[PDB]
């Protein structure tokens, strides 16, 4: 894959409910957010967009245990899971909530209410 985050994110959903203005794009019905070799699985994802700026919305999804699975390109398989997941292109902070367990190659961030300082 070389660079996952360097590639355009794909939100695979069964229900695409796009607001007429674009204020909110609702993704429901088992959503598979894939990025390179990363495969996130949620049930309800709410992407809000004021309208105009593209490439930086807000990957906010919850419902089914949002797992962070990745194919072992380095031989080491990535594994993670939480109740709520969050990813952003600018805010490079994985904010998970509810049984939040995530490790990159060896470790990352784990707990439940992932909060910083």
């Amino acid at each position: 894959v070389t660079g996952d985050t360097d590639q355009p994110i794909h939100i695979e959903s069964d229900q695409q409910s796009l607001d007429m203005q674009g204020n909110v794009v609702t993704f429901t019905g088992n959503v598979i957010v894939t990025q390179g070799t990363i495969k996130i699985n949620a049930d309800k994802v709410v992407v809000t967009r004021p309208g105009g700026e593209q490439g930086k919305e807000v990957i906010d999804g919850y419902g089914k245990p949002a797992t962070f699975y990745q194919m072992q390109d380095n031989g080491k398989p990535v594994e993670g899971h939480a109740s709520q997941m969050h990813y952003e292109l600018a805010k490079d902070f994985v904010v998970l909530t509810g049984n939040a367990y995530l490790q990159q190659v060896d470790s990352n961030i784990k707990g439940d209410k992932i909060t910083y300082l």
Binding site: I9, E12, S13, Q15, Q16, Q54, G55, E57, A90
Partner: peptide, 21 residues
């Protein structure tokens, strides 16, 4: 901080279409 985003694309499994935001 430097901002380097990517064209996020919404894909729909029902119709099989991908609409870039």
């Amino acid at each position: 901080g430097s901002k380097k985003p990517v064209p996020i694309i919404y894909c729909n499994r029902r119709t099989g279409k991908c609409q870039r935001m």
